[PDB]
Write an enzyme that holds these catalytic residues in place. Sequence first.
Site, PDB file in Angstrom:
ATOM      1  N   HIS B 351      10.223   4.040  -3.513  1.00 10.66           N
ATOM      2  CA  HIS B 351      10.250   3.082  -4.634  1.00 10.66           C
ATOM      3  C   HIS B 351      10.447   3.671  -6.020  1.00 10.66           C
ATOM      4  CE1 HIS B 351       8.596  -0.174  -2.029  1.00 10.66           C
ATOM      5  NE2 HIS B 351       8.049   0.857  -1.409  1.00 10.66           N
ATOM      6  N   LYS B 542       5.331  -7.285 -17.010  1.00 11.95           N
ATOM      7  CA  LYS B 542       5.400  -6.123 -16.088  1.00 11.95           C
ATOM      8  C   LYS B 542       4.424  -5.016 -16.573  1.00 11.95           C
ATOM      9  CE  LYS B 542       9.629  -5.832 -17.191  1.00 11.95           C
ATOM     10  NZ  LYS B 542      10.507  -5.753 -15.963  1.00 11.95           N
ATOM     11  N   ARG B 543       4.075  -4.071 -15.720  1.00 10.67           N
ATOM     12  CA  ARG B 543       3.165  -3.029 -16.166  1.00 10.67           C
ATOM     13  C   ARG B 543       3.744  -2.227 -17.389  1.00 10.67           C
ATOM     14  NH1 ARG B 543      -1.313  -1.608 -12.505  1.00 10.67           N
ATOM     15  NH2 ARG B 543      -1.625   0.016 -14.099  1.00 10.67           N
ATOM     16  N   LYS B 548       9.867   1.531 -18.841  1.00  8.21           N
ATOM     17  CA  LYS B 548      10.198   0.109 -18.928  1.00  8.21           C
ATOM     18  C   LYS B 548      10.516  -0.305 -20.371  1.00  8.21           C
ATOM     19  CE  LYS B 548       7.409  -0.990 -14.827  1.00  8.21           C
ATOM     20  NZ  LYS B 548       8.222  -2.064 -14.142  1.00  8.21           N
ATOM     21  N   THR B 650      11.617  -6.653  -9.514  1.00  9.07           N
ATOM     22  CA  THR B 650      11.603  -7.929  -8.787  1.00  9.07           C
ATOM     23  C   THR B 650      11.258  -9.084  -9.727  1.00  9.07           C
ATOM     24  OG1 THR B 650       9.336  -7.628  -8.111  1.00  9.07           O
ATOM     25  CG2 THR B 650      11.067  -6.857  -6.635  1.00  9.07           C
ATOM     26  N   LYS B 654      12.594 -13.104 -10.057  1.00 13.72           N
ATOM     27  CA  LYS B 654      11.793 -14.310 -10.345  1.00 13.72           C
ATOM     28  C   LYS B 654      12.351 -15.088 -11.534  1.00 13.72           C
ATOM     29  CE  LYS B 654       7.989 -11.402  -8.956  1.00 13.72           C
ATOM     30  NZ  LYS B 654       6.694 -10.841  -9.436  1.00 13.72           N
TER      31      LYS B 654
HETATM   32  C1  LIG Z   1      -0.051   7.496  -6.471  1.00 13.79           C
HETATM   33  C2  LIG Z   1       1.367   6.942  -6.710  1.00 13.79           C
HETATM   34  C3  LIG Z   1       1.450   6.257  -8.099  1.00 13.79           C
HETATM   35  C4  LIG Z   1       2.909   6.022  -8.598  1.00 13.79           C
HETATM   36  C5  LIG Z   1       3.920   5.630  -7.443  1.00 13.79           C
HETATM   37  C6  LIG Z   1       4.540   4.204  -7.636  1.00 13.79           C
HETATM   38  C7  LIG Z   1       5.874   3.949  -7.485  1.00 13.79           C
HETATM   39  C8  LIG Z   1       6.101   2.667  -7.778  1.00 13.79           C
HETATM   40  C9  LIG Z   1       7.160   1.856  -7.752  1.00 13.79           C
HETATM   41  N1  LIG Z   1       6.956   0.484  -8.061  1.00 13.79           N
HETATM   42  C10 LIG Z   1       8.048  -0.485  -8.012  1.00 13.79           C
HETATM   43  O1  LIG Z   1       8.263  -0.978  -6.643  1.00 13.79           O
HETATM   44  C11 LIG Z   1       8.974  -2.215  -6.734  1.00 13.79           C
HETATM   45  C12 LIG Z   1       9.180  -2.636  -5.284  1.00 13.79           C
HETATM   46  O2  LIG Z   1      10.191  -1.882  -4.648  1.00 13.79           O
HETATM   47  C13 LIG Z   1      10.330  -2.010  -7.446  1.00 13.79           C
HETATM   48  O3  LIG Z   1      11.022  -3.256  -7.605  1.00 13.79           O
HETATM   49  C14 LIG Z   1      10.196  -1.344  -8.800  1.00 13.79           C
HETATM   50  O4  LIG Z   1      11.491  -1.045  -9.245  1.00 13.79           O
HETATM   51  C15 LIG Z   1       9.349  -0.064  -8.653  1.00 13.79           C
HETATM   52  O5  LIG Z   1       9.110   0.585  -9.909  1.00 13.79           O
HETATM   53  C16 LIG Z   1       5.723  -0.027  -8.283  1.00 13.79           C
HETATM   54  O6  LIG Z   1       5.512  -1.207  -8.557  1.00 13.79           O
HETATM   55  N2  LIG Z   1       4.631   0.801  -8.342  1.00 13.79           N
HETATM   56  C17 LIG Z   1       4.826   2.122  -7.805  1.00 13.79           C
HETATM   57  O7  LIG Z   1       3.858   3.087  -8.041  1.00 13.79           O
END
Ligand SMILES: CCCCCc1cc2cn([C@@H]3O[C@H](CO)[C@@H](O)[C@H](O)[C@H]3O)c(=O)nc2o1
Lengths: 810, 810
Positions: B351, B542-543, B548, B650, B654
């Site tokens: 991801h 979003k976070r 971002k 995502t 939405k």
């Molecule tokens: C201990 C590990 C901590 C960090 C690892 C991590 C990767 C990452 C990716 N994404 C999102 O995953 C979403 C689902 O695929 C995607 O749409 C977004 O583009 C992507 O940023 C997310 O929401 N949160 C995640 O945390």
Amino acid sequence: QISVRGLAGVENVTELKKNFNRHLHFTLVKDRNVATPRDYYFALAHTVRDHLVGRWIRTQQHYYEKDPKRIYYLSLEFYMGRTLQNTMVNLALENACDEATYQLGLDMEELEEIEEDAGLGNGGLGRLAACFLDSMATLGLAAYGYGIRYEFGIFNQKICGGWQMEEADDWLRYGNPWEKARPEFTLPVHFYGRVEHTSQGAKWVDTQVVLAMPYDTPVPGYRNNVVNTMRLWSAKAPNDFNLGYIQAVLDRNLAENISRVLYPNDNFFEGKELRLKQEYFVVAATLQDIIRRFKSSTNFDAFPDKVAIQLNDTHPSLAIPELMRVLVDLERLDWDKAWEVTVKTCAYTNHTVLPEALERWPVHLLETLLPRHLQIIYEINQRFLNRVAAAFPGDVDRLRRMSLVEEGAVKRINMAHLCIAGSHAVNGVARIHSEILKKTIFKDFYELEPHKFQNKTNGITPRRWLVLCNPGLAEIIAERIGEEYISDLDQLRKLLSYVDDEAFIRDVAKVKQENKLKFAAYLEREYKVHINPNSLFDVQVKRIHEYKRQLLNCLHVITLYNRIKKEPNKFVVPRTVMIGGKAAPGYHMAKMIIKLITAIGDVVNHDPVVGDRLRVIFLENYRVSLAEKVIPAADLSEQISTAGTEASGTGNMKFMLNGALTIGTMDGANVEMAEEAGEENFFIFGMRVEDVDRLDQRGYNAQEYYDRIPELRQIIEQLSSGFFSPKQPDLFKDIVNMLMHHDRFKVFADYEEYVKCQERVSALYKNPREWTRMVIRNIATSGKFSSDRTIAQYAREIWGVEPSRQRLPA
Amino acid sequence: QISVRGLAGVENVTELKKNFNRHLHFTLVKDRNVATPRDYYFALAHTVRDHLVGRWIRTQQHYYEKDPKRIYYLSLEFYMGRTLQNTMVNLALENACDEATYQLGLDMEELEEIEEDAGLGNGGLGRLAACFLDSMATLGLAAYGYGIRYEFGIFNQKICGGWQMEEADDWLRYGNPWEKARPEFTLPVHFYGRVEHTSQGAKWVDTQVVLAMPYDTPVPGYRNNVVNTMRLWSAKAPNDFNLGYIQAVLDRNLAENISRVLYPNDNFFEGKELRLKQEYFVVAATLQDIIRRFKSSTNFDAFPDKVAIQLNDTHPSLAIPELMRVLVDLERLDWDKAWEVTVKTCAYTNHTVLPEALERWPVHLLETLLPRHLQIIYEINQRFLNRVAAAFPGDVDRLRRMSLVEEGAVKRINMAHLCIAGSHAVNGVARIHSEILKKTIFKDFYELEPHKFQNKTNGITPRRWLVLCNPGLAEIIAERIGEEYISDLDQLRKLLSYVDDEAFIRDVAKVKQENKLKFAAYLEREYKVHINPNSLFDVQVKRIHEYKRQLLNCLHVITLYNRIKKEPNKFVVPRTVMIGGKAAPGYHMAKMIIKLITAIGDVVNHDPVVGDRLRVIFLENYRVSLAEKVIPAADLSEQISTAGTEASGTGNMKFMLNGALTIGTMDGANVEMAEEAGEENFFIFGMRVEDVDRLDQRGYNAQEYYDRIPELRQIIEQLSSGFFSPKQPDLFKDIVNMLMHHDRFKVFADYEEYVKCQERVSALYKNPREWTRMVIRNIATSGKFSSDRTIAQYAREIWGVEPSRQRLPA
Ligand SMILES: CCCCCc1cc2cn([C@@H]3O[C@H](CO)[C@@H](O)[C@H](O)[C@H]3O)c(=O)nc2o1
Ligand SMILES: CCCCCc1cc2cn([C@@H]3O[C@H](CO)[C@@H](O)[C@H](O)[C@H]3O)c(=O)nc2o1
């Protein structure tokens, strides 16, 4: 099947069945191909709880419109045991559910065995609270049980190589259908902080907040449609609590540890912070809830006409300075008026005279934890001591003895003194115990306020302790005299005209015979151990304590063994000696006694010469539901505490009700039991209270008994030399040492008279018919020992409310 | 009321009503005079859950007899949000319950607002898992969600003086009606210990045991009567655990801390023990449960024909060496055969490409905690590197780059490398993300095994993200083209022939207008803040992350402000700029960005000159249920990550589904959204992936932009000089400093093109009709972004099962 168990209606049986299948499907989400007995237990428990609720809701409603005076029973212990059968019994559903479950192809008895005990208590004091709750509901009092919902109750006891192992009682693991969480009535409780003085008076500030969340459990009256509430508090941390982030969330557990575990000493007093926090926690949450209920009826004059607070020992003694704190600091009543209200509200029950059992909190603990309560307490003390000084001018000694503040290396607050000063009634729990209170430890207080001191001899509930655990005997009683005695146990006195009836005699014996056979089978199925059911069942069950003298029992058992080995070809009345109970985890001696008991079993149960004439069994994990099985099966009840140490006892009463004869000392309620049945129908031996004082004041020298009793000398020798511990010869050196040099409980002084009395018991047992006639005289005079009597006395003589036996409408 | 919400039957409405009153009385133990809305929420929730169970049980039964291949979705995150409405919607009960609750005199919408979000996830990755679960049920796959039941989910965010405060999400406080505890399927999980070698092979011994207890939550398909299971594990200590006594019982909490709290970084990778224990915990419990289910169908050849395990990022990567451990150490298959079975079972979804997000566990951690898994991992590495060596002989560099073991000051295991070696398929989450994977970080792996690498562009479920949150729009769509599009979202493409229809144009606009008005009211009632609903709603939710680029948004907002203040009497299209999201607690910069955003609000919202032409709102506590309200009300969707950093996104989908236009970069799934709608119906600006590489390889110098753009220079100056922080003038020095000297995300390089593109957006907004026609073209080409498409692709191209849209029988 049997008639005390109620009607099996055709409609009732049919509704029970569909409701059982509804819960199986909707509540449990199982179907009949995956369900285990656990699931079956649950669907039944949910089905019975369904019948409670309408009544529960209607009963709370009644109290709202009637607005009667309310009784609050405060206790850190509620020893409830299982709920299902008791619920069925009080609702008259027992036979219906038996039928209903039979037609589903289940055995209800096998389902009952799945329910965990609610072991939220240690022994007599916890279980009294439980009997009292049942009796209160049954007599229509508007009464509330208040305590703590411990996540872990009394530990489960395992024997490993004869040693007690403790493991955690995870009683909520599978859920608890009886309770209803009420997160909506959550209340703040405060700790630490400091006290600021204003123009406006004292203020308690910078406190840590712990939330208290209540859980309500239904307490159903006996066939009167009353259902009262037991409210138990649970600790939750607040949400901004501590609030790097991860650790802050994990530390939420420090706050919640308050309700995690029940303290398991009933021997000693440990001045541990956690315990004091539990005491404050139950009292702060409970009083705010009480006051809130009082406000929904400014005017605290009527408060004592609406509220009665019963303190079960000193454990919730902080109710007193907490009530003051609220009334003075929050409602702004003046001191004198608040104090009047408090005394007229509170009453105190004492359960022991053993000095090491008394709560004496270190002042440094209260200062850090409850700084304002200490202020109130000093002010209580000061004003109290001026009454003392004024009534006994010049008696500076009285003043130090009576202080709520004990001086010494560390200052302590004596919590008992607090309860007497701030209560309008103080009671003991059996007549001799109350006299001793007046003549020894509270003599000064009695001279000051004789009107405060009363007696309320304990009792047990005949619903659990006869109807529930002993259906056979309840039925044959009911054949002759009706069912009315179940809530009027005095009627048992009518069995006296059945003492010479041949059919009754045969029936009483037959029931005992049945309970023995059934318990002997319970012994083989569940613990793989193997007993002659024609023997006399000699049982001592209760917590392990030096004052309860299981050791004295051990010395008899070793004597029987030794006499068998001396003349092996002579006849002895065979016996199964059974002894059970838990020891508090840090009570070394208590743990040594358990080890001796199993060690005697390793020798006696494996002597080919002894045959099945003597057997020694240590009954593992004694607890409420084990008592329901072993008590009905017993012939001899052992109540052999040293005169003056057992405040009342209640085990003794359970056995009387269930057809055992009693061997015991004139201690506690034993005195009144023998007075009720006739000393002739009792096996009384040993020193009276007076004899113990005579021995003390000249000195107890144990050597004297060792020198004049060769049977005794022999036993001590076997103990010392390794006879009972061939691998560690010196294993029992502590016990022999205690027995010889510092026995506070004078085990040797009662040995001769006890062994002789034991021979008289064996003699009566050789004559079945005369044994049973004596049983009948016992069972028949057991009426006084109903908790209905006890609660009715509390109600009239302390709380000022009138019992009602009248049905509420369904 | 509206037709997509199902039938209000006369029988249905009547049964709902009696069942609601049954639960109120029997389950909740209330009556209608004491019940609060919370009680009303619960009785309704219990009533709807009743309709699930029959289906839940029947669906599990079907899978038993059919025995299809099963899909296990492993994830440490499930971002579920509320369950009630979603359940009603999938069961077609929405209108009935509305009617049923109306006639009881309750407002169902007001009851829905009482349900806590299940916030068991951080953001996109958690929420994907949730969409996927809904889509899997809807397409009749025999699929199981497996995770951890955290006691506390994502923290609730409070703003205090513009700063984020975290407080604990106590989501289970009042209970959770959706779950069913299953203490009967509790499983041991092992930690620590050591490894002994026998004649018979390796043995893992002297371990600490933590029990894992599952909770089952129903996942209902869309109107197909399928109900699948989400199983979540909870940590319990064993009973002999540690087993002075008090402390031993309290320390039971160390074991249970495993499931206490969700880790809240999605930025970074923290190598914390607690986290690794959570990862091992979910994987050990899950595999034993999987294997157990497989055994009830010796022969592990069929294992891959019966089991598919999908790994959601590397969080459950230990599934791989754990599967080996079981197969080799416990079932005694030889290495080569176990390894074959494992690869054919497992598949991996990546991801992100951000190097600091990658899991690299320190070897010393794995050695203490999981010593055997480290052995397996070394053996995996060794055998893998021999394949590498043999295919690229002499390339010693490839060997260091490809090692699962990274050398360096501390040795680490690279978990991504593990997943590629031991999985038969690796996928990205949007087409450009998958290319970047193949061309950069996993280039070496792709050259070795090109067949493993696939793409699965993300999607969202149109049940929650349209039907549920936006009934108005779903209804007007359904008026024109039917209801079939709810599970076949490609049909939305038929709205293309309605692009010039005057009635449709009016209806689409009217719905947007309604959602705006309703959300503006939500803003005043719940957070006392005050917005012009005729403005363009410009939202970024979003976070909070540097990649971002909420900062880029801030710079626009400050520019609009500055241009208003330069020519205050000129017309600007008024805007409400709304920005929301949580920052991970230790992410300093993220927390600074939130502060800037509120600080801009303190200036802009209180300039009399600005009027209601510009407003800046920071939307507190963004979470699933807040997204359901704000998304339907939005006009402009901001998706402005730097090219090459946002794997998919995502949120973007939405908003497309709900009638916002998109301003964004050619990043992630943005690329495919514009490709589907036409670049003309999209507001694309800024660097492409290629432009970013060109800038890197010559060096990003931010000073250059500051020197040539006076509008930009001004903003930095206001930032530096205290304009936005008059009390601490140097408050934002970190941000200005980062922006100028070490911006990894090239905020300034995209500034010019972004502001211009923003003017084009304002221009289209001046022409309502043409704005809406563009909206229609967007909404109409959103079909590709259904998670039904995504899951169908996983199913055929990775798991080897065929979707089924066929109803199961009721
Ligand atoms: C201990 C590990 C901590 C960090 C690892 C991590 C990767 C990452 C990716 N994404 C999102 O995953 C979403 C689902 O695929 C995607 O749409 C977004 O583009 C992507 O940023 C997310 O929401 N949160 C995640 O945390
Ligand atoms: C921190 C404090 C720890 C020790 C204090 C304590 C006193 C005491 C009394 N009793 C019994 O209470 C029973 C109920 O009155 C009674 O029948 C028994 O005679 C009496 O021994 C009891 O069961 N447990 C108690 O613990």
